[PDB]
């Protein structure tokens, strides 16, 4: 029966004023802290150097495939130490 002053809620629930098919959103705290942009900036992630285009070099590239495809000129190895 006795409503102690601590409880004594003067106003009515946010629902029962509409309280059915309307969405009651209580939003105090932000999400996604300041650091995160909002309009994401384009960012090209690069790890390592690479050349946009082939660098031009003395021997023609077909002749490199010629060797690689045609004959036993090719070798392979590992450089170590």
């Amino acid at each position: 029966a006795v409503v102690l002053h601590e409880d004594k809620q003067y106003y009515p629930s946010a629902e029962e004023v509409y309280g059915s098919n309307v969405d009651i959103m209580v939003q105090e705290q932000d999400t996604q802290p300041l650091s995160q942009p909002i309009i994401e900036p384009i960012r090209h992630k690069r790890i390592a150097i690479e050349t946009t285009n082939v660098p031009d070099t003395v021997y023609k590239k077909e002749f490199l495939f010629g060797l690689l495809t045609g004959t036993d000129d090719v070798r392979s190895f590992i450089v170590a130490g």
Partner: protein, 43 residues
């Protein structure tokens, strides 16, 4: 359970939960925030 027999009061703080803390209020002076702000910075 003879110690709990001697107590002249019983389960008083039995239904102590919930409260209107979820309910937003458009009254800066009668929110819960403010009741805590005056709870703390005094006495």
């Amino acid at each position: 359970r003879r110690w709990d027999e001697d107590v002249v009061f019983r389960n008083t703080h039995k239904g102590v939960d919930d409260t209107p803390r979820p309910g937003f209020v458009n009254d800066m002076l009668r929110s819960e925030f403010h009741k805590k702000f005056l709870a703390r910075f005094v006495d």
